Design a protein that fits this description.
The structure is a homopentamer of 310-residue chains. Chain A has 310 residues and is of the alpha+beta class. The first copy, chain A, has 2 domains: 188 residues, no CATH class; 122 residues, no CATH class. Chain A is built from 5 helices and 11 strands. In chain A, the strands form 2 sheets. In chain A, strands 1, 2, 3, 5, 6, 8 and 9 form a 7-stranded mixed β-sheet that branches. Bound molecules: nonyl beta-D-glucopyranoside (5 copies) and 3-(4-bromophenyl)propanoic acid (DQZ) (5 copies). The site of one 3-(4-bromophenyl)propanoic acid (DQZ) has 7 residues of chain E, from strand 2 and strand 6. The site of one 3-(4-bromophenyl)propanoic acid (DQZ) has 7 residues of chain A, from strand 2 and strand 6. Chains A, B, C, D, E: It comes from endosymbiont of Tevnia jerichonana. Chains A, B, C, D, E: One of its GO terms (molecular function) is transmembrane signaling receptor activity.
Chain lengths: 310, 310, 310, 310, 310
């Protein structure tokens, strides 16, 4: 019949989440408990009941004994996995206890930036068996898997963590076991508030103050630079993310500021054209719409994206 | 006679395409099925019909048995190939089943940016046999090769994928086998629309609004900065790409905006010179050409590149 | 009974502290003294009393003799540990003397930027025993552990260093030994003085000089750009640090400059509106509040953060 | 007498040339043919006439047979050399055929930027024998060495390629063999035309158009910003290159634009000072020199560097 | 008694000096000549008098023969040392000749930027013996150590090179041998002249030309932006260097330009205030101090730092 292989995986550190590259990096420990009766050994009185091996001399021992080990792969792994510890402890019984401490980057293919920066994402690690379920069946090692207390991440905040077993058909026709460690994390909005919301709101508010000067030309020059500032901010936000084929809530907000600013230019050009054509008195009356449009326009726009996305 | 070696290659992830360096990076699995009758082994009843080996003790076994393995190379490979799994399963028969899970950057020499960002490119992986076709003939392993479901790429979108066998003469006089996994991908234009087309169009449109002010000096100062903005945008686009010896559709568009902006300065200088020489009334009549040239000039220019490239 | 394992750890160099990534990197030496009576050897007269081994042939010797070594891990390690020396010197007695020279990045999870740049941080290295205290008990090797004379760091300045032993339960039910090398460091404020305090103070002071011109429009244009400069400075500071979910003393200072500058615009708009509405004489009298507010506002704000944080 | 060792080296890819770091990187294959009569073997009928080995078990075989191999070094190598293939094929004869596929960065010490961007450089690879010419004499393997068809470089264009043998005295008193693969490459000027020549020429030309406005103050403000733009461009060019102790043709061009721009400011200050001192009519007559100096100054300057450098 | 171990170290390339990180990187060769009479071997007539080994099988041979090797460490090493060659040639005598070709980054703790860019620095490599002087005494291998002819560095220029032996107490109570290869290098000032001195001098000079316009407001606006430019230049210089706790000659120069520019604003505000208060004729007389202060102020400041630092 098939031998049960117990998989445990604990993430100790989140060394970073790279959203631009849709990957994350962690320091973690993998724990395997697999009982192979052929590995059983007799000991003379006094000598150890538990043999401890390096991985290299353990695999070599398996090859001599013609024993197949539950060869596994981190399916969503990326690049190099720098190992710290790869140790085996073998009991009289045949109970092999394996520990693998590593640092690695993993694929984050579940990334959805539609609501960025208000988004919540799913990150996971797939531990696949190369051999099919008729030889080795993966089971959940009980008191081990999950995320630590000192992960070191400052922007993301883990909302929930889960482990579950399933199947894959990567190398074989028959189903093969897959252990999954999943977690969900959401953003600490402070960065976004401090670096984007407050500067953008400041530019808008202090620019509106200048309307009380009743200089239409001065408004035009101001809305002109404001438009460039928003174009600049637009590039800075573009930097954090991949070259997505879809519109972000952030993109919508930025395109929104462009449109209002464009109309601010357009409108004040008209008011200055009235002034120029000897209808200065009229420009002055209409100016009340000009002054009160500006705040309403941005507030209307803000409710529009909020409805349009939530 | 020559032994058939079955090659399979599956790309699981596109970790990135670096167009500036004309290379791409992938996580993939290589699968080899090669029957060597000399590798055949006898087993006593009950014992394994399938011996499983690490790559190191398998090659050492070949060297003892004085057996030549189908030594292969990833011809278009770049730098380090970080391996995850290099495992061998040997049957009584001599059927060696090899699996190689790796992460690697590969050369993308097929890169043609003439129509960028509207371009479609070809990416491939060459798996060459070091030994000639009289010793080892490469065959396509049937249900394996291709690209996965979760590649993780956000800008490129795979239009088609193919596998085919051919020959090379890299190390030998005689022809040697080459397995090829090719794919074509094209861009998600959203990034370009959001970061380049809309900002450039905004600068142009809102700058045109100001013509209704009938201040020629103000137009000159505006077209002056606009020219610098386009020069800046020109550098930002230069960043994404190599220092090509050829003109991009993007380069054409940018050079086009320079020329129109240059003439906008030139023209408005003339209109302001008429005004200055007591012919203000004339500048005012001609101004209608000045106002309507601007939109037509850019629309004429836009049809010109489109014809000139498509 | 359990065997005492003596741990010594000396940091020779601080290759860098990366605050944006909340990690630090060091070149160091680990020293272990562990007496295993089973390792004892007899020598014929004249031959060595001290056998010297590479780590690889020492571990292989342990595996033959079926001896369990005090397998240890650098708990807060990050990525690769580039080794220089991994040497063993074994006495007739069984006294194994191990030396491990390495370069490594470590996690700095103790990072608190609330008072940045006036902050003091704690950095440490955890050396855990994989095996529980009933088998191996970690002890402090006496004349070795600590930090060197040539660490090479220029901004941080080590205020204090300590070593202490404790316990962890990482792999086992029972307590396992943990050796800790801690140090505290604080910043050399010069960089911050030269690049941030002096430029910001200059912008403010020379901008205030211009108030003696009695041009309200000119003040408005100046406070407008000043606001953008501070927004720029705000991004430059954002660069050095993680995307924290909390307010830095530095953030407070920057938000403070925004508010005063915003009011500088607001106020001068009012004074210019009085001038515009034929009350130029009144604007002139009030102007004395306008001139003296500016210095007081910034000095009041400076005492406010100082109280609010200290 | 000394044994002839045949060296072949083929560069398959130029992964990049880093001029700022004066190094280049390539994917290449090294081929060695060396006949050692002591390596000769007898085979029983039917068994292989050609033994194939991994490098590791081949060197171990040499050490048993007490055979010295022609130990070689890539003299101008830099950092890590990521190997793909290191394979040996040994004939009944003793003919050892070695293949080494690698990716590596090499030193480019021949770099002369005096005529940049119009420069032509020399790049090479030195393959030195550790042992002197009395033991091993390097010979050129005939149908192999050189550069490929798909190098992947876009800016450089290989003008010529050569191989030659010489001597070095690196480790020994006596001469030791050195195999050299050299190539010369020159630049595709398009990047420079598109990003530097056209933007600089545009700034100059459209700035000259404004002279027809006959506003001296406006010219001064324009030449002021133009000077800053050129200072900016100067830093952008500084980026591509090392901190050379010599003047580049590019440096000369940039310093040239500074001087003319400085005089443009200087001159127009004088013309505006005449206007200011009631000699407006005189400023107007001299203005024709002012208008025609500008184009001549830059064209005169362009012939001056061309003569001064070619 | 103790065995003499001859150390030779030749730096072939300076791959770079990173002043921001206070480290340097080199390609070099280490040469060791150590005579161990126990390593002596007998050969039958005709067979080799010199056995050649890989490092791995040489160390394994030492471990069998129970011979202690002079284990050494590059004390100031940083990260990974990418080896090219690690070869041993053993004579009948016992004369072991070791060669170690490597690429490595080393600590530069001797870095003093007080006179930057006019500074001269000391760079070195420490080769320590792990074992004390009673076992192994380090001696200088005669015709080998030093720096090469093609180092590839462009900014630094090696003023002098030295080798000397001393002692350390890193791992032991007793003194242990240390071989030292030191060199001093100074800067090629061209980069600094071209990118910093000439642009700063240009800004100052062409800004002074504008004083001949007798527009105080225009001077104020100019000195305002000039101050920002210097603040920008200040950040660009900050980039090249660490976050030092001390004042650089460069810092002094920059702070100097700030002060003069600040006073230029201050002064011209006063002159414009006289003009504003109907004392235009007085502003005009004082203006001669205003015009001649500017050049003297900067020349006075330049002699002040020169005295203050030299
Ligand atoms: C910009 C936000 C601050 C607004 C406060 C009003 C005073 C003017 C600030 O300088 C402004 O900066 C813009 C951006 O570049 C320019 O387009 C504009 O012409 C210029 O007047
Ligand atoms: C710039 C696109 C927005 C146009 C809207 C009209 C109002 C003015 C906006 O500021 C302008 O910015 C240019 C770019 O730097 C400067 O050259 C120019 O002198 C300045 O007036
Ligand atoms: C800026 C600090 C120096 C103040 C000295 C007064 C002279 C003017 C300096 O240039 C100013 O720069 C600001 C920042 O961008 C712009 O908003 C403003 O319109 C412009 O006049
Ligand atoms: C700059 C090249 C374009 C010239 C066309 C004339 C219109 C003005 C363009 O804006 C100018 O930009 C300069 C560079 O920053 C500033 O110094 C200058 O005061 C400003 O007027
Ligand atoms: C700047 C060095 C060149 C001086 C030559 C005099 C002409 C004006 C150049 O443009 C100036 O650029 C400054 C820097 O941003 C601005 O503060 C200032 O308002 C603006 O007038
Ligand atoms: O091939 C390798 O490197 C590791 C594989 C491995 C498989 C099963 C156990 Br239990 C332990 C290790
Ligand atoms: O030399 C190597 O590292 C790998 C080569 C290899 C060749 C054939 C088979 Br089947 C498996 C492996
Ligand atoms: O497994 C390893 O790489 C190193 C472990 C080790 C454990 C105890 C001593 Br004493 C020395 C070394
Ligand atoms: O020492 C090494 O790694 C490689 C050296 C080498 C020398 C001669 C032949 Br032929 C093949 C290889
Ligand atoms: O432990 C190592 O890797 C290298 C050490 C070494 C010591 C002495 C000689 Br001679 C040669 C080599």
């Amino acid at each position: 019949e098939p031998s049960d292989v117990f998989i445990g995986l604990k993430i100790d550190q989140i060394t970073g989440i790279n959203q631009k590259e849709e990957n994350f990096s962690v320091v973690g420990s993998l724990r395997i408990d697999w009982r192979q009766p052929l590995l059983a050994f007799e000991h003379a009185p006094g000598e150890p009941k538990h043999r401890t091996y390096t991985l290299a001399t353990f695999l070599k021992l398996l090859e001599e004994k013609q024993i197949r080990w539950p060869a596994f792969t981190y399916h969503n792994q990326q690049g190099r996995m720098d190992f710290q510890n790869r140790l085996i402890s073998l009991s009289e019984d045949g109970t092999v206890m394996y520990l693998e401490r590593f640092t690695s980057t993993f694929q984050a293919p579940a990334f959805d930036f539609r609501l960025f920066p208000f988004d919540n994402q799913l990150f996971f690690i797939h531990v696949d068996s190369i051999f099919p379920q008729h030889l080795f069946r993966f089971q959940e090692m009980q008191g081990f898997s999950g995320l630590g207390d000192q992960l070191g991440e400052e922007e993301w905040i883990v909302t929930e963590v889960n482990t579950h077993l399933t199947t894959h058909n990567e190398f074989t026709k028959g189903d093969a076991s897959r252990f999954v460690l999943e977690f969900h994390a959401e953003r600490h909005l402070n960065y976004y508030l401090m670096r984007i919301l407050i500067p953008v709101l400041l530019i808008i508010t202090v620019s509106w103050f200048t309307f009380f000067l009743q200089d239409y030309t001065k408004r035009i020059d101001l809305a002109g630079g404001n438009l460039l500032l928003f174009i600049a901010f637009n590039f800075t936000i573009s930097s954090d993310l991949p070259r997505l084929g879809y519109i972000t809530l952030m993109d919508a907000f930025l395109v929104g500021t462009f449109i209002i600013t464009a109309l601010v230019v357009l409108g004040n050009v008209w008011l200055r054209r009235l002034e120029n054509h000897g209808k200065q008195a009229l420009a002055r009356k209409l100016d009340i719409y000009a002054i009160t449009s500006y705040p309403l326009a941005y507030l209307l726009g803000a409710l529009t994206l909020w409805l349009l996305f939530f």
